[PDB]
Design a protein around this ligand. Structure first.
Ligand SMILES: [Mg+2]
Ligand SMILES: [Mg+2]
Ligand SMILES: [Mg+2]
Ligand SMILES: [Mg+2]
Ligand SMILES: [Mg+2]
Ligand SMILES: [Mg+2]
Ligand SMILES: [Mg+2]
Ligand code: NA
Ligand code: NA
Ligand code: NA
Ligand SMILES: [Zn+2]
Lengths: 71, 202, 98, 102, 54
RNA sequence: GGAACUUUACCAGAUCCGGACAGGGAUUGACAGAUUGAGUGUUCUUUCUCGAUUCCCUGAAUGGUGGUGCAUGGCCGCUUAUGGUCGGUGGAGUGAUUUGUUUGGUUGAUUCCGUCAACGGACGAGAUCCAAGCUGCCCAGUAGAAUUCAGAAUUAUUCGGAAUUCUUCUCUGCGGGAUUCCUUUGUAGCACAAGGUGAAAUUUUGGGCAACAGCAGGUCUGUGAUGCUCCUCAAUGUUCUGGGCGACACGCGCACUACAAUGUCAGUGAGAACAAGAACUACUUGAUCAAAAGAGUGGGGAAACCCCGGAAUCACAUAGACCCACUUGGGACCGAGGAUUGCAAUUAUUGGUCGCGCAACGAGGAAUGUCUCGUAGGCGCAGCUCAUCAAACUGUGCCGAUUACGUCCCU
């Protein structure tokens, strides 16, 4: 696709806060991590969630990200 | 020889469709809500589902035996090869087949339409439903037809999975003038197609 | 073709009607209806059977339904007593006894 | 001795796979040689018809489809052994036909 | 008489067969030996087994 | 909705009661003759059976492609293929009513991001489902392949008994795979373009389902869905016979065949897919010591028969014919044999043989439809209707391009 929806972006942000020390900048390891820590009936959706989660992690390595509170 | 596979499947499909139609017209006031059967080597047992099993059974099973003999003659089943049992529906607030018949009962009596439709919605929502909707249309007031809907809760309307999370029913009620048709849609609470939950760690 | 029902075939349907307690007849007027009564596969034309049950119903003696071209006639408690007098018996149908 | 062929056919995909997976476990308990199962090609039944009941507006059609599933298992055991393998309560919609191969 | 219904007794033509539900003789579906009206089929397809998929 | 009877609702005639149920020797059939379209007791004359089943008066009831779709239900079409729709509490206004639901960028998208008298929610979009393309496990005496021994042919390679093994191709229930993933540009968070990886690179491709409101849109010819109406015993009910729905040198919509040489005719080669079949479909062999269409005999069936499915476009170094003309282009109209389906081919049911071809037609005025890649166009094949008939519709495969990847000029 081109543009991600609210369902993807909201869910992909809970993943970052709960599991921040199991993620890195690689899409393929992140997807394997995500499929074990979430429930959903469509593999297409889980692919996009891991796609955006990788994008967030790169931004966090640079500076703070709005709406993400690691605490 | 024997018939082919394409014809055995189709012949066994129009038997269920005629059986459903037959049982629908008899046990309509008693609240018929689906019928299933399973052929074995010894018999052809059939299972009914109603919310008024006492009235379906009849005295010493009189009503069930009159229903037994009707099916035997129509399909030429041999004696001792057919059997029927009646099981009770779990919750009557989650079957639109039974709910629509409660609604028709109020309508065939002197009952206000709004007071009638508010009863069904409140009951099913109290019984544990997830989304409900009632539609009454056709010559409600005056010589012009009209439609009156009543919605409550959440309800999906598109996609393919809407055929598994939603139940529906219909009926035609014979008024003094004209006809009235009422529908009831109930959302039964596999997860939803587009919901994601994240497991809490530790 | 003809609704003239001879008496010997009129009692034969009644005895089957009392014995089994129910009759089903497909609604076609070019055809014949058969019943097994003690091994006798006596047959009546459908139009004659259809005519006999129209008189019973209008006298409030049977209950009737229709579904997918097939009739279903069932006799009432008023009808049960009436058939007892006509046939001179004292049983209780068949899906009534036990 | 003899070879017996079992044919499984139903309109539902899950029911077919549940019965056949049962027969293999029961057959292996009796220590019977097995040839199969084989997944025969599925036939698709199609009927297409117009939606309107009066013939007006745009000409719109809908297509109704049916699927039929089929499996076969060849055993190596006399009649009595087979009479015990398949004696269970299969769910509705599925049928099993016994054939003695030449 | 003897001529009453003599043409229908032939049982050959488009006036012979009837819908197994409607008892109507217009636009029947004889594929796979169904004998159902086009309208009746769309109202009973689910019970028979056919489902709209594509 | 491809109507020979039926379908049939229309026209000319003859029947039956299919008016239940109640109130106050009945009656049903029949030989011969006449009436009649009728070797139809329809009615008449003459008799003869059958036996309370129905007959005659009334009320009532039943029936009716009879009526109103502007009395209704249900279903379908369109508005509308777009991105729309709506609460609660709160702020503003005497009020109808407003905010949220805007202004900027982005997206097919009220899709996302920042700003903000709002904040919270819901449906629609997305997600979900089906099919195609790549791949894992399982699997075959209803799919196949390789190898070794017997056989047979040409002068190593070919063809058609016994064996072993084995899944590259075929079959399919659940899985895997693609996510703007990686690099760079324009850059001023959301994203875009080119390239990489790759079977597949942007909603991957093609479909299905689709909100809220409305139309006096269509249907009472589907239905044992109906209000209200109409007729109701030589009847608008029902059956039978005959005719019509097919009539015309008129007009209009949508198709098929052509106007030829990038061709027509006569040979020869290689070579699909989806389907359907009584449980009717179809092979082989006769007919054949002489047209075709036909007839007739034995057998075989549902990944096992049909079937190694011998389609047509297409190809040919075929040393074949024709040569620019209304001509071997085109095949309308008409004549005379003969066979097949059916109870019944006279308004041709359809197919095959010879003849007619002197019927327009030589590329089509003003106007006008659809279309962006296995697509347009071209080519055949199945299913449906079906006893017989596809210039139609619903699907499948085969050969396979030109142009643009833009804009708001017309709508
Ligand atoms: Mg015709
Ligand atoms: Mg006629
Ligand atoms: Mg009618
Ligand atoms: Mg209207
Ligand atoms: Mg307010
Ligand atoms: Mg050519
Ligand atoms: Mg047509
Ligand atoms: Na507004
Ligand atoms: Na109108
Ligand atoms: Na146009
Ligand atoms: Zn019908």
């Amino acid at each position: 696709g081109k543009i991600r929806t609210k369902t993807v972006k909201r869910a992909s942000r809970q993943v970052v806060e709960k599991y921040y020390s199991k993620l890195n900048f690689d899409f393929y390891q992140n997807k394997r991590v995500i499929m074990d820590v979430t429930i959903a009936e469509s593999k297409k959706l889980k692919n996009k969630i891991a796609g955006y989660t990788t994008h967030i992690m790169k931004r966090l390595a640079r500076g703070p990200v709005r709406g993400i509170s690691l605490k | 020889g024997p018939l082919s596979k394409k014809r055995m499947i189709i012949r066994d499909g129009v038997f269920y469709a005629e059986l459903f139609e037959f049982l629908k017209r008899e046990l309509a006031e008693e609240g018929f809500s689906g019928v299933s059967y399973h052929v074995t080597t010894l018999r052809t047992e059939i299972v009914i589902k109603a919310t008024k099993t006492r009235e379906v059974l009849g005295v010493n099973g009189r009503r069930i035996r009159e229903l037994t003999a009707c099916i035997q003659q129509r399909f030429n089943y041999k004696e001792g090869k057919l059997q029927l049992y009646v099981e009770r529906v779990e919750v009557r607030g989650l079957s639109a087949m039974a709910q629509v018949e409660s609604l028709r009962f109020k309508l065939l009596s002197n009952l206000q339409v709004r007071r009638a439709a508010m009863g069904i919605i409140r009951y099913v929502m109290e019984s544990g439903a997830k989304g409900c909707e009632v539609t009454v249309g056709g010559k409600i007031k005056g010589q012009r037809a009209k439609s009156m809907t009543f919605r409550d809760g959440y309800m999906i309307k598109s996609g393919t999975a809407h055929k598994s999370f939603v139940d529906s029913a219909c009926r035609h009620c014979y008024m003094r003038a004209g006809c009235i048709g009422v529908k009831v849609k109930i959302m039964l609470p596999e997860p939803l197609p587009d919901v994601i939950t994240v497991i809490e760690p530790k | 073709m003809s609704t003239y029902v001879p008496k010997p075939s009129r009692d034969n349907v009644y005895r089957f009607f009392f014995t089994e307690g129910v009759i089903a007849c497909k609604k076609d007027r070019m055809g014949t209806w058969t019943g097994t009564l003690g091994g006798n596969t006596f047959t009546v034309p459908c139009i004659q059977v259809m005519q006999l049950m129209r008189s019973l119903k209008s006298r409030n003696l049977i209950k009737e339904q229709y579904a997918w071209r097939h009739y279903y006639w069932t006799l009432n408690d008023e009808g049960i007593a009436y058939m007892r007098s006509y046939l001179h018996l004292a049983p209780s149908a068949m899906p009534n006894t036990q | 001795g003899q070879t017996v062929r079992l044919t499984i056919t139903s309109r539902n995909a899950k029911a077919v796979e549940s019965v056949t997976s049962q027969l293999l476990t029961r057959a292996r308990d009796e220590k019977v040689t097995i040839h199969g199962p084989v997944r025969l090609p599925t036939r698709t039944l199609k009927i297409t018809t117009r939606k309107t009941p009066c013939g007006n507006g745009t000409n719109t059609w809908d297509t109704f489809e049916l699927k039929i599933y089929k499996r076969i298992i060849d055993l190596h055991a006399p009649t009595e052994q087979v009479k015990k393998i398949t004696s269970f309560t299969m769910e509705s919609g599925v049928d099993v036909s016994i054939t003695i191969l030449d | 008489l003897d001529q009453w219904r003599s043409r229908q007794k032939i049982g050959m033509g488009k006036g012979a067969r009837c819908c197994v539900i409607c008892s109507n003789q217009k636009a029947l579906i004889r594929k796979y030996e169904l004998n159902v009206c086009r309208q009746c089929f769309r109202e009973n397809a689910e019970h028979i087994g056919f489902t709209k998929l594509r």
